[PDB]
Design a protein around this ligand. Structure first.
Ligand SMILES: Nc1nc2[nH]cnc2c(=O)[nH]1
Ligand SMILES: Nc1nc2[nH]cnc2c(=O)[nH]1
Lengths: 450, 451
């Protein structure tokens, strides 16, 4: 580690306009636990391949090549100054698959996904450039923010249903148990057991699911191949807008309602991510973590535009991988003896994820169980969003509102979500603004609270 | 008119009848005009089971209509037998039961299946109720699990709106949830002439506006209004009962077990929600002493289910409460003696009026083309209240972290999975949690998900 950090100061970097550039070994140290974690947990990156095969009609190797593009994409946040361990807009997957499902899987569905993803890029770019992203984090009421987070969490679960199982159950419970039990103060100091688990993070739950999954017979054994992965970019190019067309203007319209809801859901992920960062920022007094919402929009905008052209992504580019981000945050809060900086954990993780792509025996090992990894990220997201959304509710008038908001955001048709927000406005103006149904004071609530 | 009136601070007049306390309308409690008007309209949710009967059980409309008369009599048993919980279906368990039924040929085969399932749920309610073990579970079961069940059940309910089969429903849902929310506050009716007039209609405004929008937009065909008195074709209905068709082999009862159990776990949540709301308004209303007998609720519910099994097998099953109706009565009840005399005068009047309403053929035929709005609405609204109450009932962050895991597994539609979770949860609990490996969990230690 060339440049070290002064206590209470910000992590070393090179100023780069709206971005703060950090490289591994130069600006932050290389974390062995996040290395091992990314060497194994990149399977979730590979877990998109089945969706690519179904909805985009792509052969396995073309799908495998796409994940190299996304792997590069996952390192941009810690590269450009974002403490949010990136991923997909995972609670938007069901909505996005719903959209794609109305196109023939193949070139037609690829043009469709291009139109959806470039818009999502544009929405992120404008809200980030005009700094209108930061405003919304401040302006939007807490009830709505919590309604969105919870709704987004419940969407993640109508999804586990729609994408397509003892594997997933043991996977979910062990994963969620570790996640939960390692969010407490001084856990590692209490037992030798929790000390050793904390260095593996999500690995135990994932690997144990696979194991149960193999022996039980839910998924076939792998056919391990030795050597270095050889991404077929010639093939991949056939499934890019460079080869297939670009969509007619009419397609962009069909995208709009899905584009928007996919953003609203991502906005949730930003709230969840910085909720966790803000917390561990206060625990760790030795680092000054910058929380720039506009930069998260910018990086994410870049990641999507990049994807749109080079690897159209059914899960889209999202601000965080909720469980990976929570897992790193937990290890970060454990102290400098454990993790030097939030970027040393965030950065190393996906860096190792990128290299891991080239470990052909791992790629080939994970190949028959990719479905376990896909449904698991969905389940784990749903868990953390529900948990965080709930806790962020302050009184009972917020909860009364968040309930209405969550329920509408978990009905999968996005035109319908907009029809709700629309009708919600009309009802608000004619009834609520005049306070015809009264003011709502949490201390007055006698039926649902107290 | 009301023969026996209640002394202030006492329990509502009744006739002792063993485990039950018998109350008739006009004799033990007054006849509430608002709940009369409400049940004259809101009995549509009772008729909204009809499509499920047609679809999953393969029966013609009229056989299904007659079934709703059997259910209608069933809905009056709680207030008749001393249960302050406005009754209904096990609504978050509908997807699960449909999933179960979905593996049988719609028709006699599926009716035999639904019998075995409903007799089982009945037996479970009977045994837990006779052995007073229903009361035990409500006390002993940790709060985290109780809330996990409630939140779980709430989310399962929306996987149901997706699975059962729409601007109508959005308007219906938002207005209905809006009213319910805003009429849960103290002195609301004293605030505005608007809320004063709204409170006397309860769920009706949301329902009727959903129906209307539903007609005018074209999502549902116009009704074919027929004048006169409903004439339930019980001759026809008999053909689709286990009396006419067979009774299922032992093998089927075994397939039913895992679904039966989960339908109970979900009903248990509905019991918690109902008595959460009752206990609150019981303290608001100091002039009435409301007895909260959990075991009596199991008995009446057990009776209702066994009743159904033979006379009208019910895809939604017989459940401890209709969540929005119970929330609605409780709200109007909390407004004071000027509005509602007793929790039984409103709850009792409501379904009494629903039963009479079945015989109003102009309303049946009016509601017929638009039943789908009604069925989806109760699903959405149950999800809404369960989520709201489950969340609020959580006290710390360790309870919440546990409730999260539980909610997520109980909202996966396969019921065998929910048990594999409880199983794997036990195995995991015994080997890791009890030896206290992975540390203690105290909410003030929580720095990631709390503080
Ligand atoms: N938002 C989000 N994106 C992901 N990409 C992979 N996993 C996840 C997740 O849990 N959440
Ligand atoms: N549990 C339950 N059962 C019902 N039956 C009709 N409506 C409902 C409801 O909201 N909840």
């Amino acid at each position: 580690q060339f440049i070290k950090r002064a206590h209470g100061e910000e992590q070393p970097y090179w100023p780069a306009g709206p971005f703060k550039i950090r490289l591994p070994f130069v600006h932050y140290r290389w974390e062995l636990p996040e290395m091992i974690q990314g060497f194994f947990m990149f399977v979730v990156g590979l877990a998109m391949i089945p969706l690519l095969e179904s909805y985009l009609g792509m052969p396995y190797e073309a799908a495998l090549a796409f994940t190299f593009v996304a792997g590069v994409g996952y390192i941009l946040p810690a590269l450009l100054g974002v403490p949010l361990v990136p991923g997909w807009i995972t609670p938007a997957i069901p909505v996005v698959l719903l959209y794609l499902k109305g196109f023939e899987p193949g070139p037609e569905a690829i043009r469709a996904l291009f139109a959806l993803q470039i818009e999502v890029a544009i929405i992120f770019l404008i809200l980030g450039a005009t700094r209108l992203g930061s405003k919304l984090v401040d302006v939007i009421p807490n009830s709505l923010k919590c309604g969105i987070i919870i709704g987004a969490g419940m969407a993640a679960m109508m999804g586990e249903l729609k994408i397509g199982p003892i594997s997933l159950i043991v996977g979910s419970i062990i994963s969620a148990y570790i996640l939960f039990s390692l969010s407490f103060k001084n856990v590692i100091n209490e037992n030798s057991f929790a000390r050793k688990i904390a260095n593996f993070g999500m690995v135990p739950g994932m690997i144990i699911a696979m194991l149960v999954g193999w022996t039980v017979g839910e998924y076939p054994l792998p056919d391990i191949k030795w050597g270095i992965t050889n991404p077929d970019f010639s093939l991949m190019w056939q499934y890019l807008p460079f080869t297939v067309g670009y969509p007619d203007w009419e397609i962009f319209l069909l995208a709009i309602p899905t584009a928007l809801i996919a953003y609203v859901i991502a906005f949730g992920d930003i709230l969840v991510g910085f909720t966790l960062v803000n917390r561990v920022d206060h625990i760790r007094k030795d680092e000054k973590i910058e929380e720039n919402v506009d930069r998260v929009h910018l990086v994410t905008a870049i990641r999507n535009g990049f994807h749109a052209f080079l690897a159209p992504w059914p899960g889209l580019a999202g601000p965080l991988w909720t469980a990976a981000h929570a897992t790193v945050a937990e290890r970060y809060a454990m102290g400098r003896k454990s993790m030097e900086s939030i970027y040393s954990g965030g950065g190393t993780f996906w860096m190792s994820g990128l290299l891991a792509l080239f470990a052909l025996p791992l790629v080939t090992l994970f190949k028959p169980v990719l479905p376990i990894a896909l449904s698991l990220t969905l389940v784990l997201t749903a868990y953390i969003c529900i948990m965080v959304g709930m806790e962020q509710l302050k009184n009972s008038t917020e909860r009364g509102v968040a309930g209405i908001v969550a329920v509408t955001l978990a009905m999968p048709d996005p035109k319908s979500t907009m029809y709700a927000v629309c009708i919600g406005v009309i009802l608000y103006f004619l009834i609520e603004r005049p306070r015809l149904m009264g003011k709502h004071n949490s201390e007055d609530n006698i039926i649902f609270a107290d």
